[PDB]
Design a protein around this ligand. Structure first.
Ligand SMILES: [Cu+2]
Ligand SMILES: [Cu+2]
Ligand SMILES: [Cu+2]
Ligand SMILES: [Cu+2]
Ligand SMILES: [Cu+2]
Ligand SMILES: [Cu+2]
Ligand SMILES: [Cu+2]
Ligand SMILES: [Cu+2]
Ligand SMILES: [Cu+2]
Ligand SMILES: [Cu+2]
Ligand SMILES: [Cu+2]
Lengths: 278, 275, 278
């Protein structure tokens, strides 16, 4: 229960790229704790982030980010010699800005939104191998006053997997009726997808909720997405529909049949989920 | 005509039936199933009880997008909310108006262009049921929405329009000046792009800009994937006049192989120049 | 540069459809100077354009435009005999209109937007051959008061090529830090794509810029698009990021690996590009 403050802090974090089991690779904030997706990075508009990056891996790796402000030296491409050699370290810097009126009279959009970072050098100079291996994660940049959620869950459609998981293994997320639940939805790889949530719905705009009665944004429960698309939203769990095992899945039929499905488990306050019997 | 405030409790019967050629369809009366299924129209606030009967020999279900439904009306075998052969079940859809929540945020209303479809035939995601034709449109209107003269539903289902054989339309007729509503739904395996000659719409809830402050892009071509639904109203012939106005998927092999139809816009005298 | 005036002029131009080398086909405003993409057409809402069209080729050809007001005789399809026979001429007329209140109290959208024209009869009755061969070009319709760019660049994803160019050959576009640069981005053919620009971002609305602090449009740097989609935007070159070779590419991973890539070369005021060697 709260809102994002105004930003402008200089922030620091250590990040590592590490091999994981089965040919996978992940980003982590502590050694041996790499995850797919990588760790959620949250900033308020105006914040600067210095990522003190370490490549623990035996092959080059990079960190490229969407939406945020970065100089070429933090592009994270071989083009710009801003990759990281094996065993090497590098500080990537991401800046963000508030919205404001330009001198030419136009309005400059702020950095706020649902973004993501990923590798750009593993396998190919566009990171095809590193992204396939799991080198991706979410970045939320919040505008002053944006509503904060009770929990945030990241769902990545990477080719024919969710979060590089084996088919038919979710992931599942739990909430209680009334929780404000934030979804970060990212796509990667070769395929288009359509993200669908049973029992819930959001506005197709920056925050996923209408700004008020004048917001003409479409309200949807199904959204087409392709490689490197990112969007997000906040829903009220069970709003107008109640507790239950609410499925979410890609709606491309073969993709849902092959396992691109998971559960949003919404509990009443007493913890019950009517009719859930897996 | 403009939509009123909703709030009524409404009722329909619906049946799932086998149709010719391994197809299956929904209908509001027995032996009268259609593909797409019947158009369901509600005002925000309405409740709909669908007294549903599975007349076929395989399980079927009814799952809806966008509307408010309890988990018992999800329409999946996972919840045992499917309908066994010969069975019946009442699925209930509710709808709500927009309004501010107690937490201070704005809750969107139910209004928009939605759809219902099977979730259990062939697979536990309805792949065979959707392929066979078990889909239909639902429109929920907001108080004050302008009402159209006609509503036409165009479903891109895999490589087909409305499960029709290639190059068989469908076509739709209007008169210049008619306010025509299009419901545009996609199902199956493929992405598509919907395109209309001679006409354009806003990429927002209603397909019409709300006024001069609406920044929505105006378009005549829209990418869509399985279970996407959108809709819009056009003034037939507005700024362009009468004629056989093509619509089609703009994916080139799809338009070449048959996902094309005609919006046949008539002069007042009933004729179409150039057709 | 400034702002678009109110429209309402009646304009005329010659257009030719011509064969080019390698089995290609292009539109041009001067005989012998066709190009792929075709010439940029720019109109202010309310303007009329009479295109005096000549088919110099040995196959029937047409001119079909998106978004604009055209009568059935300027549809440019075989079904109403508005194609152009080999050697023939025809006047295609495009009209446009301002937004306005209808007498019924509803709001009529204006013609403004990022549009395109292309063939509709070469090879198939949907122009599959003509489009593949290069018969496509951009149309911009501006609203009174739209900000004018310093330059406009057109990027067409046509099947697996950019602008029918051999793979890995760009195109590249040059700008100086602070330039107001306009991108028109058109897709054609068989495939879906995702368009991504490093170092830059835009608003997913008509103009690509937020109208002000009440515009809830998502700000993005990645956008899914399919055959005959058109969108555009304006960016301030290097805004918040500095000079550099800023890659743009399809983000479908194999497409970026197969050469659907180019460079937005943003130069320092001294004309140099840091970290880039030509
Ligand atoms: Cu890139
Ligand atoms: Cu998918
Ligand atoms: Cu659903
Ligand atoms: Cu990327
Ligand atoms: Cu489902
Ligand atoms: Cu298609
Ligand atoms: Cu067209
Ligand atoms: Cu569905
Ligand atoms: Cu066409
Ligand atoms: Cu591509
Ligand atoms: Cu077209």
């Amino acid at each position: 229960a709260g809102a994002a403050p105004a930003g402008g802090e200089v922030r620091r974090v250590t990040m590592y790229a590490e091999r994981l089991a089965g040919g996978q690779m992940g980003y982590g904030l502590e050694k041996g704790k790499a995850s797919i997706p990588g760790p959620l990075i949250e900033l308020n508009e105006g914040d600067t982030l210095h990522v003190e990056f370490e490549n623990t891996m035996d092959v080059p790796v990079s960190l490229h980010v969407h939406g945020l402000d970065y100089e070429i030296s933090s592009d994270g491409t071989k083009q710009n010699k801003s990759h990281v050699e094996p065993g090497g370290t590098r500080t990537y810097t991401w800046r963000t800005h508030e919205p404001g009126r330009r001198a030419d009279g136009t309005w400059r959009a702020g950095s706020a939104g649902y973004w993501h970072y990923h590798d750009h050098v593993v396998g190919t100079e566009h990171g095809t191998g590193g992204i396939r291996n799991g080198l991706y994660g979410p970045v939320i940049v919040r505008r002053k006053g944006d509503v904060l959620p009770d929990a945030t869950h990241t769902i990545v459609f990477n080719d024919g997997t969710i979060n590089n998981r084996p088919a038919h293994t979710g992931p599942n997320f739990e909430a209680t009726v009334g929780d404000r639940v934030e979804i970060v939805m990212i796509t990667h790889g070769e395929y288009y997808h359509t993200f669908h949530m049973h029992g819930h719905h959001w506005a197709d705009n920056r925050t996923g909720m209408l700004t008020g009665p004048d917001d003409p944004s479409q309200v949807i429960d199904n959204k087409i997405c392709g490689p490197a698309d990112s969007f997000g939203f906040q829903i009220i769990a069970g709003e107008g529909v109640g507790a239950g095992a609410w499925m979410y899945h890609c709606h491309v039929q073969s993709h849902s049949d092959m396992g691109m499905v998971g559960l949003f488990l919404v509990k009443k306050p007493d913890g019950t989920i009517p009719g859930y019997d897996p």
